[PDB]
Symmetry: C2
């Protein structure tokens, strides 16, 4: 078969010859018992750059030795791209949410031989599921491969906002000292009120990491956690988002993007937030009105905003969240640490091993079958 | 009395008109039950900038309404400084480790009225204890005031270093995207081995904050933590440092040459070090080497040598550093507490009533 695999670009300086460390830490399962990927074998060293065009998810040797073809490109946008030209006869498509090859209806019409749409990572937002269903296209993901990655990045961003880390580090890096400058916007996190919207994999991992900071933990979700978890972490349940926000020193978001949660943080709803509240969002850019948030950081309504999701994405060069005051932004990278890649590359081979073997794909991996 | 209070400069845009937030969280006690400072009153609103010259630790009205004089200065280096010149007849000296007024033996000997040498913050690193003992000067610190602050700053640094946050952020700020240039040096913290050298107020606060990141926690110290603590945090004790460094992905140094080219040989290839303890603790050039060569994957801290660090201090710009100026213990939050404890010690001292034992370093003519 033909496998089309859309990956992001290599580093500008070129593809890493060497890495910072020899291996990654061994992990057996994810919180909640789901074991890590279990491919029969892997042809990479964990810790290699696997999600860029030259890392190829460690897939080529295994694909080819077994008589399949692998075409790897980063050129995925619109009608004339390599992605689009190669799709028409592709049996498998693989891409990452960090560089998504969209499987629009129009595109799935054309993928005459498409059998598998694989997310190397989590979700299927780039894939029209109903179209996949009508064409008998199996849609899979590497469930949980990066939920912990994203919660670490969230807690890191909360701390960094609270303690005014990024400007503080600019002062060192630029030759200054300027203690009062570093700290006239700097607080401890301790005993702050932190709320989370949704406590799925990500949210729950975030509250768990927050707990020993002796913050006061709040949350809201479609459905509540087992009361025993609520007890072991001292959660305050809030029935609505808009009930939670007023009492939170820090709000972290884990919503999916739907017309309802689109621009749900705006100049209006921002009146619900405590003055000098911090927001962290690694869910979806659009959950927060772009210009409203910059506004808010300009007038002191919010004291910091951070996240790695943006609208549009890739974010334009002049995107105002890049340079707004008191921001701790990163490009959309949090679930593509080299650690997460190693997991999702193994997951990707694992799905492919099963798929190619007429063996059934893990239930947790399937989105559509 | 004359009280001589040395403090850091105001921000370059001036003393703040308004602040980010309207108040600070309530904290009940410190880990282990030590209470928060207990002055009769404060004259500041917690959250104000107190540790710069215009903040005056919020001590003016109080000192002066009691018939005392308060001289507040940032000028503390040399004999022609406002500090040394006002020192000769000061009854009380206050400074912060963030802008410390050294009480060297020659200074203490010139300090003819010196009764109380007060740290607004922790320790007495800048005070010659022998001379204070010989000269019957009491030395007090506001114990615990910023241990939690430093701990946060540590775990913040550890995450940032491990996840390559700072450069990733520099890419966003600068109009870039460059996913692979962000993550080609980024990892998750989860399941790495993290070691702390010493598990006192900071070390243990750190360990507790790392626990739910599912790291493997190591520590060494003069003594073991209680077994109940070791067990709740699945700590692995190490009897020597030498024994702990080899197994650790991240080493955080928390004190209560000697990390050099030789001792770095014990560190795992790609280890991270975070040092909020003392500048000189990690050899400037060993560290810079180790990062240039990749023997270490990161270094961060808030303490430097020399300190203040000279504009060209290589730790500022070396690869994979996550440095800040010396600030971890002087968040607005930490300041409220130590201004408070500074006032408390003062009230007690002035009325001839005894200072908390826990605040005391030197009293009478001995270590207390």
């Amino acid at each position: 078969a033909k496998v089309l695999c859309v990956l992001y670009d290599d580093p500008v300086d070129g593809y890493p010859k060497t890495y910072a460390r020899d291996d990654l830490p061994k992990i057996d399962h994810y919180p909640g018992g789901q074991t890590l990927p279990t491919p029969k074998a892997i042809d990479f060293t964990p810790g290699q750059l696997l999600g860029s065009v030259s890392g190829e998810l460690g897939l080529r040797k295994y694909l080819e030795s077994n008589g399949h073809t692998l075409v790897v490109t980063s050129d995925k946008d619109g009608p004339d791209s390599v992605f689009e030209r190669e799709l028409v006869d592709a049996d498998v498509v693989i891409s990452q949410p960090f560089w998504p090859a969209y499987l629009t209806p129009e595109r799935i019409a054309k993928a005459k031989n498409l059998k598998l749409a694989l997310t190397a990572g989590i979700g299927s937002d780039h894939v029209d599921l109903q179209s996949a269903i009508d064409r008998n296209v199996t849609v899979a993901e590497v469930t949980y491969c990066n939920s912990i990655s994203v919660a670490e990045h969230v807690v890191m961003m909360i701390l960094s906002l609270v303690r005014n880390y990024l400007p503080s580090h600019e002062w060192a890096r630029k030759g200054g000292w300027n203690i009062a400058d570093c700290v006239s916007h700097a607080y401890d996190l301790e005993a702050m009120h932190v709320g989370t919207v949704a406590a799925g994999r990500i949210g729950l991992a975030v509250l768990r990491r927050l707990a020993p900071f002796d913050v006061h933990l709040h949350y809201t979700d479609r459905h509540r956690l087992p009361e025993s978890v609520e007890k072991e972490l001292n959660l305050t349940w809030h029935a609505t988002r808009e009930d939670m926000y007023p009492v939170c020193d820090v709000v972290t978001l884990n919503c999916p993007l739907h017309p309802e949660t689109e621009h749900m943080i705006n100049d209006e709803t921002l009146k619900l937030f405590k003055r000098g509240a911090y927001i962290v969002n690694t869910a979806r850019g659009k959950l927060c009105d772009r210009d409203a948030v910059a506004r808010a950081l300009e007038s002191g309504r919010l004291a910091g905003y951070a996240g790695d999701v943006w609208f549009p994405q890739p974010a334009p060069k002049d995107h105002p969240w890049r340079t707004m005051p008191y921001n701790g932004m990163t490009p959309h990278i949090s679930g593509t640490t080299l650690t997460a890649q190693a997991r999702y590359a193994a997951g990707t081979r694992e799905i492919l091993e099963c798929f190619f073997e007429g063996r059934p794909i893990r239930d947790e991996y399937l989105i559509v079958q």
